Structures are given as structure tokens and as C-alpha cells.
Amino acid sequence: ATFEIVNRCSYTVWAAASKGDAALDAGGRQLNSGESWTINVEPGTKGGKIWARTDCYFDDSGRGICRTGDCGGLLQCKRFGRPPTTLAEFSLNQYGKDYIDISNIKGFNVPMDFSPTTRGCRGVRCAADIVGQCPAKLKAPGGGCNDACTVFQTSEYCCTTGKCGPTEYSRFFKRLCPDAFSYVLDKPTTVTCPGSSNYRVTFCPTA
């Protein structure tokens, strides 16, 4: 499956793509404002994620740090990024269908649209100014808006026991972005697409 990753932000981002225990494609790349990077994701990929990283410095060996979303200091991510990270999430070719969503469970850094480029389903978007509106206690000084689990490490926010409810913090994310997951047990906003669809992830879609 191809994923066209487009940076419409006015700032550079470092895109990342992983399934947690491995890179997807090259795993990460710089995208200046306006740049597009197309990656290939193997059919059947389960639990894949694409995200943006901000304020990154890498040396000539591809090692450094990003102010949001850093993945073990690598340009080319193998593993998931450090919150806060707006997440484009997907599982492909699951009994004949693909499943896509956007999640704020790991916080928010950069606004995103995640849409099919092929027939048969609809896209999702979280493009509100979550960083600007972020509750004081959730603000990430590197930038971004942390989720409450990251900040407070409680069963209720992290849904560790499986019985959690919405919270004042989850409701903030849900108010600003109704079509993204706001906590683990949120009413799903996953979209079912045809198996083997292709996609575009656009950072700062309303830029």
C-alpha cells in the first residue's frame, strides 16, 4: 500500500512510520514545507502508525533528538515516538478490509488529515488548534499537548484496568477533534476501507 505523506505546515516536520517493533519503509524522513514523501507499507501491516516530529536535530549518522515524537533519537524510526504525537493509525488487509483512524491518546503535536486516495470510504481529520487551546496542565514545554496518561500516570487516564471513563482532559481533545480517539475506551471513530486501499496523510491540512 502506498501512503503519500504531505507536509502542508509552514514549518519542517520529520515524518515517521513504524509498527512498533519495526520501521515501515525507511521509517522516517525530513519533509520541508510543501514536500511529499511516498512510502510503501506491506499488505497485512497491523498496528501501523504515521506521525510528525517537530524541532529535530540529526547528525550525519541519523542520530539526534526531536522536541516532539522522538523515536529513540533516530531519523529513521524503528519504534513509536515519544508523546505528544498526533497519530495516523492503520491495520491493513484484516479479513478483507483496512481500518484507519486518528488518535489523540498519545497527545497532539501537529494537525493531520488521514484520507484514502482510492475508492470506498472517507477520511478523518484532526486539525483544530489543540496546542494553542491546550489545558495548562497538559502543555508540553517542547511543544505540543500531552495526553493525561502521559502527564499523570493513573489507571483512570491510562485505562489500565479496562474500565475507565471519559475525563475532563479527554473531553478537551474530543471537543476540539470529535473524529479522533480521545481516550482508550472512546467510542471508536475508526473507518473501514476496502482492503488494499492507498492513502494520503497531510500535516496541517487547513494551512
Return the CATH number at 82: 2.60.110.10
Could you give the number of structural domains in the chain? 1
Name the experimental technique: X-ray
Q: Is the sign of the CA dihedral 67, 145, 11, 6 positive or negative?
A: positive
Residue pair 14/75 in contact by the 8 Å Cβ criterion:
yes
CA dihedral (13, 18, 23, 26) in degrees, to 10, reads -30
Cell of 93: 488487509
User: Which of 79-116 are b and which e, b meaning 16 or more Cβ less than 10 Å from the residue's Cβ?
Assistant: bbbbbbbbbbbbbbbeeebbbbbbbbbbbbbbbbbbbb
The sign of the dihedral angle between the CA atoms of 58, 59, 60, 62 is negative
Task: For residue 48, give its domain range.
Answer: 1-207
CA distance linking residue 51 with residue 147, whole number of Å? 15
3-class SS at 3? Answer: strand
